[model samples]
Target: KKIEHKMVAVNGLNMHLAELGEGPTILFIHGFPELWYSWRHQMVYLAERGYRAVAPDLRGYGDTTGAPLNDPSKFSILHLVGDVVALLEAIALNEEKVFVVAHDLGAYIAWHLCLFRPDKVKALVNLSVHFSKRNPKMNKVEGLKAIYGEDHYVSRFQVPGEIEAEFAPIGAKSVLKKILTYRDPAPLYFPKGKGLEAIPDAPVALSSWLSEEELDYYANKFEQTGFTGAVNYYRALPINWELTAPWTGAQVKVPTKFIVGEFDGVYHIPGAKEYIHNGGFKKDVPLLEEVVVLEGAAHFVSQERPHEISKHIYDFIQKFT
Candidate 1:
C-alpha cells in the first residue's frame, strides 16, 4: 500500500510532502516541470522494502513557499540546497548520513548538497543533469547555443519579462504543453501549430515510467501552483553561477551513481561530463560508483524506466555499498 504524510511549515517552506515506508531514509529530489509525484513508484517500492521514502515539493515547486515567487535571486542553487539541508534536519535525520536521489534540477541541487555537507549525503543517485567541475559561469545559458542552435526558448525565458508575458498566462499551460510535449523539435512549431507537428507524426509514449494518473498529478500541480515559482529557478541560474563560484573545489565525497536515458539530450550538453567527474571529484569521490544510461528514453529515466532504474539502485545499495 502507499503511505503519505504532510510535513510542512517546519522548515519555513509552506509545503506538503507525501511520504511512504520506514527504515533507512531516502530523500527524493525531483527535477524541473515536476513535483514529488515524480518519484511515486520508488516511494512505494522502497517503503515496502523497509526504507523511509521522503519526497517533498521543493520550495516554489509544489506547495512549498516562503521565498519570493517571481524573484530570481531567491532561487539560486545554494538557496535550493539550503532548503534540502533544512528539510533533512527538520525531519529528524542526522546531518551526517542519508541517501539522496535527484533528477534534473534536483540533481544539481543534490550535487551541491553533497558538496556543502559531504558527510550528510552518504550516497547519491543523480539523473539527467551532469555535474559541472566548477559552478557554471555567468550566463551559462550561453553554452546552450551549442545544443539548441540559435533559437532557445529556455534562453528566451531567462529574460526579465518573458515569464509573465509567455508563461504566466493560463498559468503557463501553453508554454508547458510546448515544454512537456515530449516532442524533440516541438519548439520550432509553436505559436502557429495546433499540437507539435514539428515533432514526428508517430505517436510517442510518455518518456518516463510514471503512470497516467501520476503524470496528471504533476500536471495539475503546475496548473494550480502556476509555473512562475519554478520558472524563477531558471531566472536565477546566472546569478547562482556567480554566487557558487566559491564552491568550486567542493564535490561529492561519497559513493555516487549517475543514471540517464540513452537519448537524454542533457548528457550531450557541452562540458557536463568533464565538470562533474574532474578535479575535486576525480580523486576525492573514491566511490564514484556507476553511471547507467537506459536505452530508448530521454531525460526522465526514473519515470520512463522505473523498474530498470529502481533495480539498479536497489541492487547497488544491497550488493555493493
Candidate 2:
C-alpha cells in the first residue's frame, strides 16, 4: 500500500495526516476516542482500488498534533470542519472537491460541512450520527429535548467532567470489551424510561483486536494525550449547537448515506427517521440514502463489521463517481 505520513501547516497549525494510493482524494475523518486507524479498512481497500484515501487523525487524536488542550472553543464542530478545509488546502488538494466519509464525532463535522459549504464536499457518507433537524426560529433546547431525554447520558456528558474518572485509566485497553458488549441496558435496568440504557461497556477487548505491539500503539497515544481531548468532543455540545445554529436551516446538499449496527442503541433515539426527513437535516443531500441495519453488530460499526461498512461506502460512492 502506498502511504505517506507528513506534517502539513493548516490555518497556522501543523496538522499531521496520512495519505495512501493515487487517484481522486477521499478524506476520511474519525470520530471520538478514535484515530485514523478506525478507517483501516477503507484506507487499504481504496488504495488498492486506486483512490487517494487520506485519513487524518483529526486535531486531537493519533499522530496529528497541535490542538489546544484547554480550549473547548477550538473544539467546536465548525472549527473542526475548518481543520479539514485548511488541511485540504495546505496539502494542495484544494483544486478539486473531495468526497468525505465521517463517523461518530467526525460525522458531526461532516454534517455541518455539507450544510455550511455545500460546494466543498462532493458527497458525504456518515455513520452513527444523524443530521440535525431545526430551523432559524426554532427553540434549540426544545428541539433537542424532544429527542434526548433530560437525563440522557449524552446530554449529561455535555457538561464538564461527568465521565472522566471512569474512562481515563483504561481507555485503550477498554476497546475490546467495549466493542463486544451488546444491547442498551437502560431498559433492562430501569424498565421504565430514560435509564441511560445503552451506556457503552468498559472497553476490555484490546487484547483481541490488538497484539502487545498494537496495544502499545493505542495505549501510548492515550497516555501522551490522555482521553481528555476526545472527551471534550462530547463536552462541547452546547457550544457546538450554538455555533452551528446560524446554518440551522441549511440541508446537506451532497449525496449522503448512513449505516449502523442493528443493535446499536443509537437507532433507538427518538426522531431517528424523522430527523432524516426534516427540513434542515441533510436537506439537499439529493439522495438521502437508506439507513442500513447490520444485524448483531454493535457501536463500533467499521471495526466490528468492516466488510459490510466497506461494501456500503463503495456502493454509495459508485453512484456519485
Candidate 3:
C-alpha cells in the first residue's frame, strides 16, 4: 500500500515506475518474462530500511510503452541503456549516482550502463547474469549459435514473431508457468515448432515460492502485452554486439557485487562458472566485490530467496552509501 506508481516521461516514452521510501535511491532492474514486479521483495525490504526503492518497467516490458515491437533494431543495448540514462536524469534530478540492483536481462543492461555511463552509478548488485567481455570477432548471436545451435531459447527468441506465435496456442498462463517453473543448470531449449512438445508436462499447481494470485498478476500482463516486447531484447543481441565494438576489452569500473543461484541456468552456461569464479570475471569487472551462490536457489534468485537477497543488497550498498 505504501508503493507509489506513476507514468514519467523518460527517453521519449511514458515510463512506468514503482517507488517507495526515501533516502539513498536503489534502481532495480528485471529480466525476461518479468517487469518491475520482480523486485517487489527487495523494494519493500530496502524501502522499509531508509533507502528509496525505484523500479522501472524497462522499454517494451510491463506497463511501460513506446518501444517499437515490430522493429527489433530499436531495442539495441544502447537503446536499453539510453532509457535508464534518461530515467535516472528524470527522477534523480541533481543527484549524481544511485545504487543499481539488477537481475537477469536487467543485469545485462546494468552492465552496459556501468560501462557506457559509469558516472551516474554509485554501486551495483547483479544477479543471475554476469558481464562477459565483448567478443570483438563475433556478434553475440553468432557466438551463441556456434555453441547452442538453433533450438536454444535465445536463438529461437530472435526470430521475430516465431516464439510469440508458438506461445499463442499455449496461452499466457501456461507459457508463464513454463518459464517460471524452469530450474536447471543446462541450457534451455524449445526445439522449433516442437517447443511445447519438448516439455510435455505442466504442474497442476504453482511452485511453493510462487502463489496463484501472483502468477495471475504476471499472466494477466503478459496476456495483454504479449511476449514480443520482452523477446525484442534478444533480437537486438547481434546489434548490441556490433554497437559495442568500440567498448571491446573495457572493464566496468563501478563497485559491484554479483549473486546467482547455484542452480541458475546462466551459472551452468559453458565457462560461466570459470569466468565468474576464476579471474576472468574480475578481469572484466575490476571493482567487483563479492560473488555469492545460494544453494538450491535457481533462476529467480530474487524471489526464491527474497529476504536473504534483500539483506545481501542492503549489506553491500550500505558500505558505499
Clashing residue pair totals per candidate (backbone < 3 A): 5, 10, 0
Between the candidate structures 1 and 3, which one is better when assessed by TM-score? 3
lDDT of 1 by residue, 112-225 (tens): 888788877768888887676653544566666555654454565576655455544444454444455452422332222223333343244453334456656676777787
Better of 2 and 3 by TM-score: 3
- lDDT (CA) for every model shown? 0.69, 0.67, 0.88
Which prediction has more favorable lDDT, 1 or 3?
3
The lowest-lDDT stretch of 10 consecutive residues in candidate 2 is 187-196
- Which prediction has the highest lDDT against the true structure? 3
Q: Relative to the unseen true structure, what is the C-alpha lDDT of residue 186 in candidate 1, on a scale of 0 to 100?
A: 28
Candidate 3, 229: how far from true, in Å?
0.7
For residues 54-171, could you state the per-residue lDDT of candidate 3 as single tens digits?
9999899889999888999999999999999999999998679999999999999999999999999999999999998887778777877789898878888988889998888889
Best by TM-score: 3
lDDT, candidate 2, residue 70? 70
Using all chains and alpha carbons, the TM-scores for the candidates as numbered come to 0.85, 0.82, 0.96
Model 2, backbone clash pairs (residues 3+ apart or across chains), number: 10
Poorly placed runs, candidate 1 (over 4 Å): 135-138, 146-150, 167-178, 181-202, 205-212, 271-285, 319-321
